[PDB]
Amino acid sequence: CPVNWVEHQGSCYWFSHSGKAWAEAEKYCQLENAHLVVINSWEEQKFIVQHTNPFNTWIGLTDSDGSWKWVDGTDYRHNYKNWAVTQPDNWHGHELGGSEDCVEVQPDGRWNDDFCLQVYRWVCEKRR
Amino acid sequence: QVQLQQSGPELVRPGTSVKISCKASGYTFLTYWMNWVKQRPGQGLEWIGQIFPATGSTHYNEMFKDKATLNEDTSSNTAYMQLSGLTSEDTAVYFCARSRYRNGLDYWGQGTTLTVSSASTKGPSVFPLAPSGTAALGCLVKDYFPEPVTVSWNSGALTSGVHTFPAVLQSSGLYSLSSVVTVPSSSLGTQTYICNVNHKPSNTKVDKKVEP
Amino acid sequence: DIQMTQSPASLSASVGETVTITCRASENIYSYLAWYQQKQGKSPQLLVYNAKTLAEGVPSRFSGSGSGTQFSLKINSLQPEDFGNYHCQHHYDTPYTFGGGTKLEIKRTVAAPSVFIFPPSDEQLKSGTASVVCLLNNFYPREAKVQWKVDNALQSGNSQESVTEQDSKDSTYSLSSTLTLSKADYEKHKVYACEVTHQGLSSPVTKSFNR
Ligand SMILES: [Ca+2]
Ligand SMILES: [Ca+2]
Ligand SMILES: [Ca+2]
Ligand SMILES: [Cl-]
């Protein structure tokens, strides 16, 4: 992996220590030829939260365009999910977005849809 | 080359708190876990916890949740462990060690000795172990604090057959040890045997002649 | 929470021999097992991780194997730098845990101790304490037992012992046992004996004195 990335199971990961809005975080990863982390499995989920706890951390999952999509094209419906109970609930807001449309990993690792303008830590992921 | 440099030894009283540092060099400090391990005298290893400096994420052995607090100074590549409410059960060597997720501790610091004791500095009493083919004689080096004492025989001229025992911690909190040497018993009438005992923390220097 | 159990606690071997030490996890840890070497007074060094992967620069004579709950570290044709302590550790989900360690000790011929007893010095007596010292010199193997008798009454809790590391020249051990009394109780009795049991003897050895 490149300098200051973490190699794990054929992927390289970069963990921020500061926050961006979801789309700014995804744009940052794309400029690193990466994407916001796409969590493909329980094993990857455990790896991610070991490193991100206890901050809400953006991952590459969003329903901004009308349904749940992973930023790298991974099929959402059929694949690994780790939603917290009663999530996603699409909570309606105003100041940080009209509705919760971007996914964060909670301290317990479970996923929550949140407002896309929340300034959270993020993780980039690309293949080694 | 990967190097983990720990702060120096500590000797403190119970109920105090101590901060041990581990300065990392030769790799990207941010992308590895820094682990802390405890090893009590003569015992196996115990894992205290670990921190991931890039995020500050920490994971502890629950046995140490009240005892140890880990943090990191990103600007100086330094990991810290605070140990609080100290008691004599915290007396141990503490190591920092680098790891990747679900991987071994691949590089270790040199260790930091921590001694927790309410004992005060005290020089040893040196008593002869008097001899009476092979004769044994020695010196009992009793009730000193802290470690270490040094013992030599005939000012370092006599090394063969010398055994200086590891100190034992007595119930008083003071240490005791003995140093013995075996010599031909035909040398006892003629040759003088002196144990030289130096306890630099108390500026104690004893040259005890050990006579039959 | 995973318990790691290592065996044997101690293993005596010679340079050029092959030895195997084992580690058992209380639950499945797949291949997430590391082995460390630790020399006296030094920090541990990783030998093996992921149960069988040699760490950088570790000699090929070291071989890790196993998965699940049963693991082994084998050292083919031991070298003199291989003596020391070996530790296993799972590196599965945190918290990591370690085995209790295995001491790889230098084998040599059986040697029964020479035993010596030392009365308290006059100097020490003048301070109100009396230490009686029993010395077991240059013996092998390490296991030894000292029993203190004071006028034939076997003692308990008033003695402490210390054992050297293996001698750098002849690989033996020596042991010091100290019986500590006040001056009062010390001359409340007359015969002071330490009785020594070591497997290289053909019966217990007693050195004694009185006054
Ligand atoms: Ca992934
Ligand atoms: Ca939504
Ligand atoms: Ca939500
Ligand atoms: Cl507004």
Residue numbers in the entry:
A (entry chain A): 177 to 304
B (entry chain H): 1 to 132, 139 to 218
C (entry chain L): 1 to 211
Quote the paper.
ASGR (asialoglycoprotein receptor, also known as ASGPR) mediates clearance of desialylated, galactose- or N-acetylgalactosamine-terminating plasma glycoproteins via receptor mediated endocytosis for lysosomal degradation. ASGR is thought to exist as a hetero-oligomer of ASGR1 and ASGR2 polypeptides – referred to as H1 and H2, respectively. Both ASGR1 (H1) and ASGR2 (H2) polypeptides are type-II membrane proteins with a short N-terminal cytosolic domain followed by a single-transmembrane helix and an extracellular region comprising a helical-stalk region that mediate oligomerization via a coiled-coil structure and a carbohydrate recognition domain (CRD) at their C-terminus. ASGR is a calcium-dependent C-type lectin that is highly expressed in mammalian hepatocytes, and it has been explored for targeted delivery of drugs to the liver.
In contrast, 8G8 antibody binds to all four antigens with the interaction being strongest for hASGR1, followed by those for hASGR2 and mASGR1, and weakest for mASGR2. The hASGR2CRD:8G8 complex crystallizes in the H32 space group, with one complex molecule per asymmetric unit. The structure of the hASGR2CRD:8G8 complex was determined by the molecular replacement method at a resolution of 1.9 Å, and refined to Rcryst and Rfree factors of 16.6% and 20.4%, respectively, with good stereochemistry. 8G8 binds to hASGR2CRD between the β1, β2, and β6 strands and the helix ∝2, away from the substrate-binding site marked by glycerol bound to the Ca2+ ion. Upon complex formation, both hASGR2 and 8G8 bury an average surface area of 663 Å2, and epitope residues of 8G8 on hASGR2 that are within 4.5 Å from the antibody form a close-knit cluster. Among the 17 epitope residues, 5 out of 6 from the β1 strand, 2 out of 3 from the β2 strand, 3 out of 7 from the ∝2 helix, and the Arg297 from the β6 strand are conserved or similar between human, mouse, and rat ASGR1 and ASGR2. The hASGR2CRD epitope residues Glu183, Lys222, Gln226, His227, Asn229, and Arg297 are involved in hydrogen bonding/ionic interactions with paratope residues from the LCDR3, HCDR2, and HCDR3 of 8G8. The low-affinity binding to mASGR2 may be explained by interaction with Lys222 of hASGR2, which is conserved in hASRG1 (residue Lys200) but substituted by Asn and Asp residues in mASGR1 and mASGR2, respectively. In addition, Lys222 forms strong ionic and hydrogen bonds with Asp93 of LCDR3. Thus, the overall fold of ASGR2CRD – made up of six β-strands flanked by two ∝-helices on either side – and three Ca2+ ions, which are important for structural stability, are both conserved between the apo hASGR1 and hASGR2 CRDs. This suggests that the binding of 8G8 to ASGR2 does not induce any significant conformational changes in the antigen.
